[PDB]
Amino acid sequence: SFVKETVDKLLKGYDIRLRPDFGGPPVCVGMNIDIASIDMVSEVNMDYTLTMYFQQYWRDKRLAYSGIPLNLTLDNRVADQLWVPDTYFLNDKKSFVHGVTVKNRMIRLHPDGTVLYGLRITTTAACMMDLRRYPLDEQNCTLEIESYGYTTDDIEFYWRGGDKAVTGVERIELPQFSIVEHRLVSRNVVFATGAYPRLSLSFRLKRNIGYFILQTYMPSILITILSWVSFWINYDASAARVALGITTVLTMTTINTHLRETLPKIPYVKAIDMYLMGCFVFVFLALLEYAFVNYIFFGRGPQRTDVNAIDRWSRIVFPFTFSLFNLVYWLYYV
Amino acid sequence: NMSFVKETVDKLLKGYDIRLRPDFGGPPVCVGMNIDIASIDMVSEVNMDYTLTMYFQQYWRDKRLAYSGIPLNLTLDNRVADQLWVPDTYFLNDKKSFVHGVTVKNRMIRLHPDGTVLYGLRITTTAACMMDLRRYPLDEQNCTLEIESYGYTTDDIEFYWRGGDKAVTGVERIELPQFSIVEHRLVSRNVVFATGAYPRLSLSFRLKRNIGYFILQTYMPSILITILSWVSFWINYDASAARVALGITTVLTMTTINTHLRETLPKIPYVKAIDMYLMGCFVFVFLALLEYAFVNYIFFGRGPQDVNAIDRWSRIVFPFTFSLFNLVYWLYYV
Amino acid sequence: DVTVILNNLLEGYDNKLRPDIGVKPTLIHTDMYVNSIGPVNAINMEYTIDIFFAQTWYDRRLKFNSTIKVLRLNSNMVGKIWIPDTFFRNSKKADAHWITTPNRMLRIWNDGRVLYTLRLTIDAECQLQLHNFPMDEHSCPLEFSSYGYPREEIVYQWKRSSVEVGDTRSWRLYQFSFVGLRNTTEVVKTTSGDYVVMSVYFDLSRRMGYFTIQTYIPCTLIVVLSWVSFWINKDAVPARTSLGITTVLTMTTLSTIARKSLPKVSYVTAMDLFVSVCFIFVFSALVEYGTLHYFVSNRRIAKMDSYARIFFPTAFCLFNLVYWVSYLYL
Amino acid sequence: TVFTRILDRLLDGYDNRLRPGLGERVTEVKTDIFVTSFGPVSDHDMEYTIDVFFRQSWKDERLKFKGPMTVLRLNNLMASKIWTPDTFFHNGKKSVAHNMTMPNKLLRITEDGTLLYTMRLTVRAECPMHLEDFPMDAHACPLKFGSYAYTRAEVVYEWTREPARSVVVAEDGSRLNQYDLLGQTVDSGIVQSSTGEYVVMTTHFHLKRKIGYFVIQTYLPCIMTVILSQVSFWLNRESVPARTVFGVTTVLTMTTLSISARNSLPKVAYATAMDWFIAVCYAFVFSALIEFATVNYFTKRGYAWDGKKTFNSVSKIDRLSRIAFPLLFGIFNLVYWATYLNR
Amino acid sequence: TTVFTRILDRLLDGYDNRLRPGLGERVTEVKTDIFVTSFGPVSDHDMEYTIDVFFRQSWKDERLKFKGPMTVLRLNNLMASKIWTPDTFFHNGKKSVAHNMTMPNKLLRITEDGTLLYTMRLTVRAECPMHLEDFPMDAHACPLKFGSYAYTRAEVVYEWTREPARSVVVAEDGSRLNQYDLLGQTVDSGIVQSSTGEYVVMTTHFHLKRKIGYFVIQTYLPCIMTVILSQVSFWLNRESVPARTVFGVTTVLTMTTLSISARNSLPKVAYATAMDWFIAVCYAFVFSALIEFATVNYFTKRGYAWDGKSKTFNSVSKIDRLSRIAFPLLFGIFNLVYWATYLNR
Amino acid sequence: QVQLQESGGGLVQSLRVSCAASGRTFTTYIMAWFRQAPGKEREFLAAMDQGRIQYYGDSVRGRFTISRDYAKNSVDLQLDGLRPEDTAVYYCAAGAGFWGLRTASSYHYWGQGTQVTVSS
Ligand SMILES: *[C@@H]1O[C@H](CO)[C@@H](O[C@@H]2O[C@H](CO)[C@@H](O[C@@H]3O[C@H](CO[C@H]4O[C@H](CO[C@H]5O[C@H](CO)[C@@H](O)[C@H](O)[C@@H]5O[C@H]5O[C@H](CO)[C@@H](O)[C@H](O)[C@@H]5O)[C@@H](O)[C@H](O[C@H]5O[C@H](CO)[C@@H](O)[C@H](O)[C@@H]5O)[C@@H]4O)[C@@H](O)[C@H](O[C@H]4O[C@H](CO)[C@@H](O)[C@H](O)[C@@H]4O[C@@H]4O[C@H](CO)[C@@H](O)[C@H](O)[C@@H]4O[C@@H]4O[C@H](CO)[C@@H](O)[C@H](O)[C@@H]4O)[C@@H]3O)[C@H](O)[C@H]2NC(C)=O)[C@H](O)[C@H]1NC(C)=O
Ligand SMILES: CCCCCCCC(=O)OC[C@H](COP(=O)(O)O[C@@H]1[C@H](O)[C@H](O)[C@@H](OP(=O)(O)O)[C@H](OP(=O)(O)O)[C@H]1O)OC(=O)CCCCCCC
Ligand SMILES: CCCCCCCC(=O)OC[C@H](COP(=O)(O)O[C@@H]1[C@H](O)[C@H](O)[C@@H](OP(=O)(O)O)[C@H](OP(=O)(O)O)[C@H]1O)OC(=O)CCCCCCC
Ligand SMILES: *[C@@H]1O[C@H](CO)[C@@H](O)[C@H](O)[C@H]1NC(C)=O
Ligand SMILES: CCCCCCCCCC
């Protein structure tokens, strides 16, 4: 009864087209975010999807009321009758506000004129990713918050709560990543026309290497080791060393082609391609080694170093070079 | 000058009732249609439909919208279409369609002094196309687009192709990924029923599938594997390791070709022309390996209780039968 | 008659204000009817569910004195009266239904009781722990609360027939089996305030019939198949080498299927452990012959095949005993 | 002139929030469905698409009128101010009401007061499936619809004609690649819920899968691969490398076929009829190599018989395997096919 | 405060948004410029690309002249929908999005003299037809054509605000391409003719060159090594019949595996690309290496090879000697012809 | 062999010049016309891409008309108001328009050329 009179009085004569303090100091808009979840980190599309509770705080003297000590929570449809900041996300590709059962939006008024405006937004933000070190890569994805049509002479942005403005990051579980840290940046984009407010929220994602050890690196190492067994097989066993050598080449090809089908399509050379190619060369050279051994004994036999010396030399250089190749690879990318 | 145009438009829209068709109590209003096709894409064999974007124009005369004193055609804002009468034209085989709305709704309303109204739309529609793929990939397809009036018979509305055979343009500028448009036709006919005849227009294409990719990736590798299985006939019958390894690896190779083409090609769960050829080649390499087992059993099993005749016989029959199989196959589907 | 009653109720009615605003919290009784639980998408860590969501509260502003006991209406009057802003907290995507008309129901009794039901399809979020895959069990939740009204303004409460299900066989669960259902209630503290959150937990257990036939048995047979070399004469170098290396190639092919329907989690699942150990067994069988061939020809040791005929079958049976006990029972 | 006047007076004092005959009778809605095309069936999603012309006819005495006209066609804006049945599909997932180029709805009013409501819809509906007999499986996909907010005491549904002739499918309205539309069964019943008892109209479409694709792609390659494994029993026991390579490459061939066979089938956690067939074929190919391991264990002389000392006799294990293995596989096929084709 | 409110209400009294400025008097000239914030991913399978732009349009409307203390008027988005704006659409656009999160990303500004500035943020998905005959050594010029949908050349004309080269600005970090390299863009305007009249079209072409390094390591190098591997068998002794037979057949199987995977990385087109011919030639070479051994084995008289201690033994096949030279030479000649054909375009 | 045969032209005091394309379909290629004055340079005249967008040079804007017959795979040039300055060799070009559709270096397929002589 009494609340109905006060609420109707506030909206009577309200001009949505005018910001608070239209001719005076810029309206200070504070923002804090609660990250509900993060998912769909796509290396192919170079973007990510996060759901969050985006809340904006500002003061409007036109909406101040007296005689009621309560904080009036109004129906979400009243937001269309009030002024709200023109906040948008610069790197957002596709975003929406959830509308079940009703539109996920809140308007809460305070007796001093403070307005709390909350939205539940699922946005897909573009993230430029450098995958030359994939899978041992660390990514930095941001979210840019800006005002579309207001300069710092009219609106100002700040993180409400300082470094605690963004909450819920520590509870995010990514199957392929781990959030090392997050940062909050509040800067003005100074241009010739004027300064524009901007808030930046950035996450540093570190890819987990455990998946690739079991599926990529260990299978490639064991197949490469098996190709060295032919060095201990007698050189006369032509049908055995060739069969052992050519099947490991086929096995390496099967591993390489399978990974190309299950991993994301990133058409440039990555750290995972160099290792697979290196292992493919080693099994290629192992089969080539016996061909040199076979040709020396048989091809240059009747015409007439030593046949057994090549195999004995290869029993040391091949295990040594592959370990040296791994040592260079793992130090360079870590 | 401009102020005169403003009052003329107000007079035309004063008293206009969008619930009445032109010549409501008289002869049916003739609606002339022409289509400018922008592109055809996503011709899906799995979903049996294709997606096309087109400029859809409709012409009809409305004497209520006749103006004098202005020698110009009045191109009005696209939002004026909601204040006029437009035909209830729908696409019968349409599965999913929309009108582009960037930067505004892509529609036009152009008025002519005699009363002729031009109503153009930019529509992207996914139209159903039932495909007979028994001859895939050596097949032809006939995809149509049906245009009908939802609630008006031939007594109220009539359709015709404005310009005759030149009504539809842009067909020859289309470049499909795996097809080639041979010809297109325009059909105007009435759907006769007991209640009455309903106008209908039909635009149809004839798609011819390109064969270059299938020759290089499906037929030629399968032919080479089949020819390789005949090498066993020129190896000595006592070379069990050589002939069996050659025979059983070609069977494995044919299985690799069949199973991987199953994943690559669209999922069409019935027997096609591509499946018969792959199955035919699989049987031939199966019989080549089965041939050696008969040869080996004769010499060693029934031996103690000539084996060059079966190999000499196979050196001719297998090349001859496979060529005959190709002759019957390519004459049937071409 | 009825039109006058409807017009009178809407006259002087402000839908921006909840019933009993400033007096007492609005008590809401909620019921849910699970029409079907859709497929569980482990890759995206989510599941689909279709429900009929019912809410009941009291609005004294809607009392009417008449011979009619209850007004039974369609979705037309939904936007005219106050409606709770209930939203599903763990929903990635939710949609109501509109064919052929908005699937909503509004019923108002003469004493002011309002019943509001609607049909929803919800893609809720479920964090799956796959350490025991494919012998894993999950309890996927479904939480909802008021978006803007704290615990001092809107209080939710389960009715007696809180959650009801129909034919569990008609559901679209291919990989999981419904094995139970629970409902809870708690208070969650956020920046805006303290909210009453109601949760429904659906217990799911994966079925291992497909993985036994496709992975566990073919992998076991190949490991047994690699033991055939131990009974082949050591002089048959091409036979034992080709048998050993082809089993490794076949085992590599089977290792592809291990990670097919699950996300790229970076911890060793039960399926990965079995496949990797089976790969090591066939790997060691070929290495065993390479050592035997070298010492006998190229250079206890001579009896290595005798011990390999016993140790390899014994070690694999010991592994299976430890593997199938630590996961099925412990 | 007169046509315009009648349209204006129809909605005078009309309340679209109230069904016809509220407190007087039970609103009777007569419905019939014309299926223009039975769309594709998604086994992975367990849903089927269908495009229909949904016709609904009822009587509303508040819309009577007098004039020379007999049937009144209504504008869609005017048709949205008139009460219409709240029909919804119980098993529908996400249905699309076509809006190109205008809303595909039509409302006709006769002078008697009868209304005819026709709309064109694409309906995606849940079709639960039990694929334990895949690919020799048959399904009855249902289509259930009824009122949402009105119980049977207020709104009832009837078919316009006899139920067999109240659902019409076009001659070429079949968009099924893997199934065959045997026929449809039309019935109606009562469903009781927590809010009341509702009239439900049901239509069951009967589908049967085509087995021809799976025979050429899966069954024949598996059968021929097994025969190749059993072929090695006719090779001489002295050729150890030949019979060893033969045994393991057929195992690898079966592994390749088993993997590709489960790609076509939607991901279910239970064993289908095709899974059991491949599992048995895997055992037969596996047992063929185990059989040679036993034969090789009793071979004395490495050399084999020549054209013209002593030679190894033909193994009794090989002789019995040339009969027992082909016979057991033949018996299994006779049992396997007679089990599922008699379903 | 009240002065600002009065001008906004006074502006639209008598205004008719259905009529373009200067209707029947002059041509409505629109000055446009585009700032590309990100040139998004290019989809080879769909033959389309995504682009994020700030689209600007400027024109003069004498009906909106105002006098007051302020020189620039900022309009609410509701009021901006009551004023005539150009019906600019993208001719090759497929499905574009006008962002409205959290508010409509539009801005209409009016100067005192009646000049309007209209900036909007758009995500445009445009079709880019491609000739993939030279894949993966192909280059494309993806266009971006826009103009008026309803107004002919005699009613509305579009122009670039500045010199056309400087009118379209791409951000330094704009490129979001994994497989292509954005070399630059050319800006031009032209005239199109349809069944509804002559229209002015503003075109921008983005020039993309595909990266080749990925296909060299994944496809080209393994194929070359496999062909070299098949030719390695020519150095084995002719008496190793099982060894050279397994060598020959397994290289064919290895090539078959590589060929299938390499096609899965290419969009589904039915014509022959440049990589298809390279694999087909490599397939022929590996096929011939096994046929060559079949000819060598057909003349091997004795089943025993030479021994270290030393009877007559088989000689080195004259077919094998020539194959050690012809096959490496023919494959090397093919590589020079293949690369010089496509890298010189 | 892909060739761009050019017909028409000759001694003209309205002149229409055609360009027949054989050996390759240029439906999705940009077909352009170029003029080469004696010793000066090669000058862009007109072009038309797949979308029928017409481009013209400043010196011939509104004077020359370019039309493409997508069915017959040919491009025609309509010359009106000819001047002695236009007396030069006219070429027919087709290319993908890489790095600008006005640069001569962007076109690969070139016609044999046609000589047009204007005498007043
Ligand atoms: C950024 O931009 C985006 C857009 O790009 C924007 O999203 C849009 O947001 C607006 C709201 O701001 C949405 O509009 C509402 O839509 C409600 C229904 O939504 C469903 O349907 C949408 C399509 O609308 C058609 O169908 C509905 C019914 O299904 C019908 O009501 C409409 O009139 C319309 O019908 C036309 O088309 C159909 C065919 O489709 C024809 O059959 C028909 O003949 C007619 O031609 C659809 O788009 C929606 O999908 C979207 O959302 C879902 C999630 O919900 C998502 O999954 C999808 O992907 C997609 O995004 C969805 O299916 C509709 O009920 C609302 O109507 C209200 O309110 C309007 C306000 O103007 C009012 O005019 C109406 O009358 C009505 O008032 C209520 O309605 C109650 C319910 O019916 C009723 O009980 C009340 O009585 C009252 O009705 C009347 O009230 C008056 C008194 O006021 C009384 O006199 C009368 O008698 C009567 O009782 C509203 O239209 C829009 O749909 C969104 N679009 C999209 C694409 O999302 C986004 O919000 C923007 N963000 C920001 C921050 O700015
Ligand atoms: C999966 C099979 C498991 C079998 C497990 C059981 C395996 C098992 O018991 O093998 C022993 C025997 C081997 O028979 P096989 O013919 O292979 O071996 C002969 C046998 O050892 C004779 O005794 C030898 O004669 P002798 O030394 O000169 O006097 C003869 O020497 P040679 O003169 O020819 O050189 C050998 O070749 O097989 C059976 O009796 C078949 C039983 C029915 C087997 C039914 C199988 C279905
Ligand atoms: C794809 C190849 C198709 C080739 C088709 C044509 C194949 C074809 O004609 O083969 C026959 C011959 C085989 O020669 P090759 O050296 O392989 O075989 C020797 C040859 O048969 C001698 O005649 C034998 O000596 P003789 O009889 O006791 O005196 C000698 O026995 P031995 O002394 O060692 O005990 C054999 O080893 O080849 C050529 O001459 C190569 C010509 C150029 C071939 C160029 C091919 C590019
Ligand atoms: C769960 O629901 C039942 C009714 O089904 C109710 O009795 C019980 O109290 C509820 N539990 C909680 C914790 O609310
Ligand atoms: C004289 C050598 C013949 C070699 C034949 C190799 C296979 C040919 C298949 C037709």
PDB file of N, CA and C and ligand atoms in Angstrom, chain E residues 238 291-292 295-296 299 301-302 313-320 322-323, ligand 3:
ATOM      1  N   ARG E 238      68.020 -60.503 -54.027  1.00  0.00           N
ATOM      2  CA  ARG E 238      66.836 -61.038 -54.689  1.00  0.00           C
ATOM      3  C   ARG E 238      66.359 -62.347 -54.073  1.00  0.00           C
ATOM      4  N   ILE E 291      55.573 -54.246 -58.364  1.00  0.00           N
ATOM      5  CA  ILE E 291      55.539 -54.893 -59.672  1.00  0.00           C
ATOM      6  C   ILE E 291      56.953 -55.143 -60.179  1.00  0.00           C
ATOM      7  N   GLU E 292      57.877 -54.230 -59.877  1.00  0.00           N
ATOM      8  CA  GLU E 292      59.266 -54.415 -60.282  1.00  0.00           C
ATOM      9  C   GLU E 292      59.870 -55.662 -59.649  1.00  0.00           C
ATOM     10  N   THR E 295      58.830 -58.866 -61.311  1.00  0.00           N
ATOM     11  CA  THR E 295      59.605 -59.160 -62.511  1.00  0.00           C
ATOM     12  C   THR E 295      60.991 -59.685 -62.158  1.00  0.00           C
ATOM     13  N   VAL E 296      61.601 -59.144 -61.104  1.00  0.00           N
ATOM     14  CA  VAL E 296      62.909 -59.623 -60.668  1.00  0.00           C
ATOM     15  C   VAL E 296      62.818 -61.065 -60.181  1.00  0.00           C
ATOM     16  N   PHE E 299      62.828 -64.243 -62.584  1.00  0.00           N
ATOM     17  CA  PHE E 299      64.054 -64.727 -63.206  1.00  0.00           C
ATOM     18  C   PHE E 299      65.087 -65.209 -62.195  1.00  0.00           C
ATOM     19  N   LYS E 301      66.834 -67.798 -60.474  1.00  0.00           N
ATOM     20  CA  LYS E 301      66.921 -69.231 -60.736  1.00  0.00           C
ATOM     21  C   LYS E 301      67.068 -70.039 -59.452  1.00  0.00           C
ATOM     22  N   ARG E 302      67.894 -69.576 -58.519  1.00  0.00           N
ATOM     23  CA  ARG E 302      68.235 -70.347 -57.331  1.00  0.00           C
ATOM     24  C   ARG E 302      67.628 -69.715 -56.086  1.00  0.00           C
ATOM     25  N   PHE E 313      76.157 -68.994 -57.762  1.00  0.00           N
ATOM     26  CA  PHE E 313      75.165 -68.176 -57.085  1.00  0.00           C
ATOM     27  C   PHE E 313      74.507 -67.233 -58.084  1.00  0.00           C
ATOM     28  N   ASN E 314      73.312 -66.767 -57.732  1.00  0.00           N
ATOM     29  CA  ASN E 314      72.606 -65.816 -58.580  1.00  0.00           C
ATOM     30  C   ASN E 314      73.342 -64.483 -58.618  1.00  0.00           C
ATOM     31  N   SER E 315      73.317 -63.838 -59.778  1.00  0.00           N
ATOM     32  CA  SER E 315      73.913 -62.522 -59.932  1.00  0.00           C
ATOM     33  C   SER E 315      72.911 -61.439 -59.541  1.00  0.00           C
ATOM     34  N   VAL E 316      73.413 -60.211 -59.410  1.00  0.00           N
ATOM     35  CA  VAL E 316      72.540 -59.073 -59.151  1.00  0.00           C
ATOM     36  C   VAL E 316      71.687 -58.805 -60.382  1.00  0.00           C
ATOM     37  N   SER E 317      70.372 -58.728 -60.184  1.00  0.00           N
ATOM     38  CA  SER E 317      69.454 -58.584 -61.307  1.00  0.00           C
ATOM     39  C   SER E 317      69.706 -57.276 -62.046  1.00  0.00           C
ATOM     40  N   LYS E 318      69.758 -57.353 -63.378  1.00  0.00           N
ATOM     41  CA  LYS E 318      69.904 -56.142 -64.179  1.00  0.00           C
ATOM     42  C   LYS E 318      68.679 -55.245 -64.071  1.00  0.00           C
ATOM     43  N   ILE E 319      67.515 -55.826 -63.776  1.00  0.00           N
ATOM     44  CA  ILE E 319      66.330 -55.029 -63.478  1.00  0.00           C
ATOM     45  C   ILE E 319      66.523 -54.236 -62.192  1.00  0.00           C
ATOM     46  N   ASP E 320      67.095 -54.867 -61.165  1.00  0.00           N
ATOM     47  CA  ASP E 320      67.326 -54.169 -59.905  1.00  0.00           C
ATOM     48  C   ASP E 320      68.320 -53.027 -60.074  1.00  0.00           C
ATOM     49  N   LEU E 322      68.956 -51.149 -62.732  1.00  0.00           N
ATOM     50  CA  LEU E 322      68.321 -50.010 -63.387  1.00  0.00           C
ATOM     51  C   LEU E 322      67.296 -49.347 -62.476  1.00  0.00           C
ATOM     52  N   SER E 323      66.584 -50.140 -61.672  1.00  0.00           N
ATOM     53  CA  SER E 323      65.575 -49.573 -60.785  1.00  0.00           C
ATOM     54  C   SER E 323      66.199 -48.708 -59.699  1.00  0.00           C
TER      55      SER E 323
HETATM   56  C1  LIG G   3      59.266 -52.681 -64.696  1.00  0.00           C
HETATM   57  C2  LIG G   3      60.346 -53.532 -65.328  1.00  0.00           C
HETATM   58  C3  LIG G   3      59.844 -54.363 -66.499  1.00  0.00           C
HETATM   59  C4  LIG G   3      60.917 -55.213 -67.161  1.00  0.00           C
HETATM   60  C5  LIG G   3      60.405 -56.062 -68.313  1.00  0.00           C
HETATM   61  C6  LIG G   3      61.479 -56.902 -68.987  1.00  0.00           C
HETATM   62  C7  LIG G   3      62.152 -57.884 -68.037  1.00  0.00           C
HETATM   63  C8  LIG G   3      63.178 -58.748 -68.711  1.00  0.00           C
HETATM   64  O1  LIG G   3      63.417 -58.739 -69.889  1.00  0.00           O
HETATM   65  O2  LIG G   3      63.803 -59.535 -67.834  1.00  0.00           O
HETATM   66  C9  LIG G   3      64.817 -60.423 -68.358  1.00  0.00           C
HETATM   67  C10 LIG G   3      66.157 -59.970 -67.844  1.00  0.00           C
HETATM   68  C11 LIG G   3      66.476 -60.572 -66.502  1.00  0.00           C
HETATM   69  O3  LIG G   3      67.804 -60.166 -66.112  1.00  0.00           O
HETATM   70  P1  LIG G   3      68.301 -60.408 -64.616  1.00  0.00           P
HETATM   71  O4  LIG G   3      69.646 -59.805 -64.509  1.00  0.00           O
HETATM   72  O5  LIG G   3      67.239 -59.948 -63.691  1.00  0.00           O
HETATM   73  O6  LIG G   3      68.368 -62.034 -64.671  1.00  0.00           O
HETATM   74  C12 LIG G   3      69.523 -62.709 -65.212  1.00  0.00           C
HETATM   75  C13 LIG G   3      69.222 -63.115 -66.648  1.00  0.00           C
HETATM   76  O7  LIG G   3      68.057 -63.933 -66.692  1.00  0.00           O
HETATM   77  C14 LIG G   3      70.408 -63.862 -67.243  1.00  0.00           C
HETATM   78  O8  LIG G   3      70.110 -64.269 -68.574  1.00  0.00           O
HETATM   79  C15 LIG G   3      70.740 -65.073 -66.385  1.00  0.00           C
HETATM   80  O9  LIG G   3      71.917 -65.714 -66.919  1.00  0.00           O
HETATM   81  P2  LIG G   3      71.812 -66.972 -67.944  1.00  0.00           P
HETATM   82  O10 LIG G   3      70.378 -66.986 -68.432  1.00  0.00           O
HETATM   83  O11 LIG G   3      72.164 -68.200 -67.129  1.00  0.00           O
HETATM   84  O12 LIG G   3      72.808 -66.688 -69.045  1.00  0.00           O
HETATM   85  C16 LIG G   3      71.010 -64.667 -64.947  1.00  0.00           C
HETATM   86  O13 LIG G   3      71.257 -65.855 -64.168  1.00  0.00           O
HETATM   87  P3  LIG G   3      72.550 -66.005 -63.194  1.00  0.00           P
HETATM   88  O14 LIG G   3      73.756 -65.795 -64.081  1.00  0.00           O
HETATM   89  O15 LIG G   3      72.399 -64.929 -62.138  1.00  0.00           O
HETATM   90  O16 LIG G   3      72.474 -67.404 -62.619  1.00  0.00           O
HETATM   91  C17 LIG G   3      69.823 -63.926 -64.348  1.00  0.00           C
HETATM   92  O17 LIG G   3      70.121 -63.520 -63.016  1.00  0.00           O
HETATM   93  O18 LIG G   3      66.091 -58.521 -67.679  1.00  0.00           O
HETATM   94  C18 LIG G   3      66.926 -57.776 -68.416  1.00  0.00           C
HETATM   95  O19 LIG G   3      67.729 -58.234 -69.185  1.00  0.00           O
HETATM   96  C19 LIG G   3      66.725 -56.312 -68.152  1.00  0.00           C
HETATM   97  C20 LIG G   3      66.365 -55.526 -69.406  1.00  0.00           C
HETATM   98  C21 LIG G   3      66.038 -54.071 -69.117  1.00  0.00           C
HETATM   99  C22 LIG G   3      64.845 -53.882 -68.195  1.00  0.00           C
HETATM  100  C23 LIG G   3      64.507 -52.428 -67.914  1.00  0.00           C
HETATM  101  C24 LIG G   3      63.326 -52.239 -66.978  1.00  0.00           C
HETATM  102  C25 LIG G   3      63.027 -50.785 -66.687  1.00  0.00           C
END
